[PDB]
Amino acid sequence: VLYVGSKTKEGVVHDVTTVAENTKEQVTNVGGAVVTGVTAVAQKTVEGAGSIAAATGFVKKDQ
Amino acid sequence: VLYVGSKTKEGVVHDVTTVAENTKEQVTNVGGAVVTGVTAVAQKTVEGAGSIAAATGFVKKDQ
Amino acid sequence: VLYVGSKTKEGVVHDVTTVAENTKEQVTNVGGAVVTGVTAVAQKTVEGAGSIAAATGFVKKDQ
Amino acid sequence: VLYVGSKTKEGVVHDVTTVAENTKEQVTNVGGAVVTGVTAVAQKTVEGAGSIAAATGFVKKDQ
Amino acid sequence: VLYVGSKTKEGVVHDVTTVAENTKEQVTNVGGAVVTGVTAVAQKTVEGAGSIAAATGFVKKDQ
Amino acid sequence: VLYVGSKTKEGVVHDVTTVAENTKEQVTNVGGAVVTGVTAVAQKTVEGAGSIAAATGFVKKDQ
Structure with missing residues (x-):
């Protein structure tokens, strides 16, 4: 493997937004x-x- | 492996936002x-x- | 392995924001x-x- | 007007319950x-x- | 007007309960x-x- | 007006409960x-x- 001017993303997670308003959970x-x-x-x-x-x-x- | 001018992200997590307003949880x-x-x-x-x-x-x- | 001018991020976590307003939890x-x-x-x-x-x-x- | 053994309620308001969970108002x-x-x-x-x-x-x- | 053994409530307000959890108001x-x-x-x-x-x-x- | 053994409440307010948890107001x-x-x-x-x-x-x- 040999990179030259390589802007690599490899095995990545990004930009995972999550909003939640007026929630009511319950777990049993x-x-x-x-x-x-x-x-x-x-x-x-x-x-x-x-x-x-x-x-x-x-x-x-x-x- | 040999990099040259390589802006690499490899096995990364970033930019994980999370908002939560007026929540009510309960776990049992x-x-x-x-x-x-x-x-x-x-x-x-x-x-x-x-x-x-x-x-x-x-x-x-x-x- | 040999890097040259390599801005590497490898196995990283960053920028994990989290907001929470008016929360009410309970665990048992x-x-x-x-x-x-x-x-x-x-x-x-x-x-x-x-x-x-x-x-x-x-x-x-x-x- | 003449009362005798009179359990009177006259012009009364009672027992006005009100619950509110995870509210988000806004007035302009x-x-x-x-x-x-x-x-x-x-x-x-x-x-x-x-x-x-x-x-x-x-x-x-x-x- | 003449009362005899009169348990009178006249122009009364009572028992006004009010609960509020995880509220977010805003007035302009x-x-x-x-x-x-x-x-x-x-x-x-x-x-x-x-x-x-x-x-x-x-x-x-x-x- | 003449009362005899009169347990009178006349122009009264009582028992006004009010609870508030995790509130966020704002007035302008x-x-x-x-x-x-x-x-x-x-x-x-x-x-x-x-x-x-x-x-x-x-x-x-x-x-």
Whole structure:
């Protein structure tokens, strides 16, 4: 790999706006996984067998 | 790898705005995983078998 | 690796704004994991089998 | 008038509840009359020609 | 008028509850009359020609 | 008028509760009359021609 005058963006997250006015939430979780907010995961490389990259609201109950 | 005049962004998170006015939340968690806020995970490299990168609101109950 | 005139950002988090006006939260957690605030994790390299990088609101109950 | 064992309520206002959650108002008044709150006027007797009893949000510009 | 064992309420206001959570007001008044709060006027007798009893948010610009 | 064993309430205001949590007001008044708080006026008798009893947020600009 060789860059020359390269304005590169590679594995990036940007400009994620979020507004919320007059909200009323309520959660009742039992052993689960509830996710309500903003999530911004930026990666470039993930290796490995059986791996997990960027898991939001994930439940794993394998044997 | 060889860069020359390279304005590089690689595995980056930026400019994540979030506004919230007149909010009313309520959580009742029992053994779970509730996530409500802002989360910004930036990585570049993750190795390994069976690894987990960037897990938000995750429940793991393997055998 | 060899850089020349390289303005590099690599595994970075920046510019994460968050406003909140007239909020009313309430949490009732029992053995779980509730997360409500801002979280900014920036890394560059993580190795190892079975590792966990950047876990927010995580519950692990393996055997 | 003559009362005997008289549990009288005469010209009364009571039990006016009002709840308000996650409100966002805005008023831009110019020479007028804006009214937004609770108003409870209880009277029993008003006399007189040309009088005005219990005027809410009233504009009078006679000649 | 003659009362005997008379539990009288006459020209009364009572029990005016008001709750308000996560409010955001804004007023821009110019020569007018804006009214936003609770008002409780209790009277029993008002006489006179041209009088005004219990005026909330009133604008008078007669000639 | 003659009372005998008379538990009288006459021209009364009572029990005016008011709660307010996480409020944000703003007023910009110019020559007007803005009113935002609690007001409790209790009277029994008002006489006179051209009088004004219990005026909240009132603007008078007669000729």
